[PDB]
Design a protein around this nucleic acid. Structure first.
Ligand SMILES: CC[C@]1(COP(=O)(O)OP(=O)(O)OP(=O)(O)O)O[C@@H](n2cc(C)c(=O)[nH]c2=O)C[C@@H]1O
Ligand SMILES: [Mg+2]
Ligand SMILES: [Mg+2]
Length: 539
DNA sequence: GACCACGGCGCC
DNA sequence: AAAAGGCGCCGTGGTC
């Protein structure tokens, strides 16, 4: 390309190099642009950011987040990664996309700019005629990237002092647990090493090995296994408590306080837009889509996520959403009737599991019932179910047959989805998002059947993701109007932050936008709460 | 100091 | 662990 002086003309494709992958923490090492057979290299990257009206190119959102960090309004536009991801969601990295669609992902801004231009041309060619994929790109993915850039740049407030104090307490309790474990083993060892634990449990203490690990065939020490060995030795209970505390302390309590940004005073995640096989977002650096919530200590940790002074958090979560999506895709009459009578399948399974009245089903029970409901739906085995319910194999077998006979059309849809995936080589969500699943005709049963469970799951999980994405695109502009913020997405949940005076109006509005994002054969319901912390805002 | 593979486990 | 699906991060262990 002919070398031209900075700046580039309007509509040019950008290339840029970061000192590290996280845009909120990265130094912008270089910046360049490409258009009309020219490549313009910025003498000094930071100042050059001011000359752009739009971040157009590979990883556009990342550059936009860094721009927002610097107080510049530089929205992301076209991004060949989004085009490639729609064509085939196995396209998740610029390294692969470049190799596949006509170039090489290097570490030089100018070359990344030229590559962005060429890849866009070629990928735009591939999507011509693909009207439903083009719709997803224009009406969902491209606009969503701008929304995500703002969320990432905004961050969420965290009660650091609270977590620091919690650490010192959890440390003392962990010490009590390991001290006990060691006394029972008759000697100290690395309790964190599942290899050393394996030897202590099954060799020295001679406990029964229940299962094996996948890749290396070692005797498993997983929670599911320790659970079955709960009454076989007192040491086992200590180990399960040790595991819970150490998991929470090492993953959340300790790391998170160290990640507060100096400029913002807040915690910043990344929302990865081309990361999953189904169309879901993911979150990383840190992952804020897996903050604890189940156990008492987990709930303590979730309370650390708080609103800014003078603001409130608003949490909205779709009700039983993949089940409602299943109703629409399958067309089962019984399942539809469930959602039009306002029945709660998660609560019904809960009351049955714990053998209590429905008004007696508490939160901890209902969440347990959810893993059972989706477990069975997406192909759980009778044996695994009888194990997690501490009921006879015959009883688990019965629960699973009743489950599907209750909703006849479901099996039918599953079968027709697999049939169609074998012919075309892919399955699709309600909006035409595709996932390619080539193993549907594998000749090894276990491989084939694994492929099948992935295949018929994707339309359901992916449609739910489509709905949430579309809802975020619709909702974002309305929140800006009201001086409110979008903070996090957790698959079918949104956490917003609103001035206290507007919080109530924001909650009502967001609930309506989400519920009416795209009407189905059943109503979409959304639970919403308001509170000073993430836990309170759902309770 | 960086990789990666693995088992394991947090959430949806 | 076992015919749930989708993720990302932890510590260990091995390596460079
Ligand atoms: C993105 C949709 C979804 C949301 O999770 P959710 O909000 O906790 O549950 P609901 O919306 O169904 O019900 P409600 O409490 O009313 O909101 O992730 C899925 N999910 C979840 C779990 C726990 C699991 O173990 N396996 C699983 O596949 C399927 C599910 O519908
Ligand atoms: Mg939900
Ligand atoms: Mg949810």
């Amino acid at each position: 390309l002919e070398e031209a002086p900075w700046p580039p003309p309007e509509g040019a494709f950008v290339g840029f190099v970061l000192s590290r992958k996280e845009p909120m923490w990265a130094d912008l090492l270089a910046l360049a642009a490409a258009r009309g057979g020219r490549v313009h290299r910025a003498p000094e990257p930071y100042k050059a950011l001011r000359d752009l009206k739009e971040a157009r190119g590979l990883l556009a959102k990342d550059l936009s987040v860094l721009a927002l960090r610097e107080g510049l309004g530089l929205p992301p536009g076209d991004d060949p990664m989004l085009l490639a991801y729609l064509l085939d969601p196995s396209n998740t990295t610029p390294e692969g996309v470049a190799r596949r669609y006509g170039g090489e992902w290097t570490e030089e801004a100018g070359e990344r700019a030229a590559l962005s231009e060429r890849l866009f041309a070629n990928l735009w060619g591939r999507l011509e005629g693909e009207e439903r994929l083009l719709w997803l790109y224009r009406e969902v993915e491209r606009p969503l990237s701008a929304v995500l850039a703002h969320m990432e740049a905004t961050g969420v407030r965290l009660d650091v002092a609270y977590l620091r104090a919690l650490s010192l307490e959890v440390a003392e309790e962990i010490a009590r647990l390991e001290a006990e474990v060691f006394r029972l083993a008759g000697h100290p060892f690395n309790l964190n090493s599942r290899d050393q634990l394996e030897r202590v449990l099954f060799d020295e203490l001679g406990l029964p090995a229940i299962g094996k690990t996948e890749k290396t065939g070692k005797r498993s020490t997983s929670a599911a296994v320790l659970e079955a060995l709960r009454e076989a030795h007192p040491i086992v209970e200590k180990i399960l408590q040790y595991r819970e505390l150490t998991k929470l302390k090492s993953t959340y309590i300790d790391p998170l306080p160290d990640l507060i940004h100096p400029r913002t005073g807040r915690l910043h995640t990344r929302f990865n837009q081309t990361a999953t096989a189904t169309g879901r977002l993911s979150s990383s650096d840190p992952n804020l889509q897996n903050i604890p919530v189940r156990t008492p200590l987990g709930q303590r940790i979730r309370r650390a996520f708080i609103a800014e002074e003078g603001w409130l958090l608003v949490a909205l979560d779709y009700s039983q959403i993949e089940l409602r999506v299943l109703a629409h895709l399958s067309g089962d009459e019984n399942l539809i009737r469930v959602f039009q009578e306002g029945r709660d399948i998660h609560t019904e399974t809960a009351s049955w599991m714990f053998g209590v009245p429905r008004e007696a089903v508490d939160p901890l029970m209902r969440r347990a019932a959810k893993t059972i409901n989706f477990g069975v739906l997406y192909g759980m085995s009778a044996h695994r179910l009888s194990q997690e319910l501490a009921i006879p194999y015959e009883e688990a077998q019965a629960f699973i047959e009743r489950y599907f006979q209750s909703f006849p059309k479901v099996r039918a849809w599953i079968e027709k989805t697999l049939e169609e995936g074998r012919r075309r080589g892919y399955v699709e969500t309600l909006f035409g998002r595709r996932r390619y699943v080539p193993d549907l005709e594998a000749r090894v049963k276990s491989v084939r059947e694994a492929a099948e469970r992935m295949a018929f799951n994707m339309p359901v999980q992916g449609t739910a993701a489509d709905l949430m994405k579309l809802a975020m695109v619709k909702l974002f502009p309305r929140l800006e109007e009201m001086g409110a913020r979008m903070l996090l997405q957790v698959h079918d949940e949104l956490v917003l932050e609103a001035p206290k005076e507007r919080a109530e109006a924001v909650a009502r509005l967001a609930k309506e936008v989400m519920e009416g994002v795209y009407p189905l054969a059943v109503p979409l319901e959304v639970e919403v709460g308001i509170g000073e912390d993430w836990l309170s805002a759902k309770e």
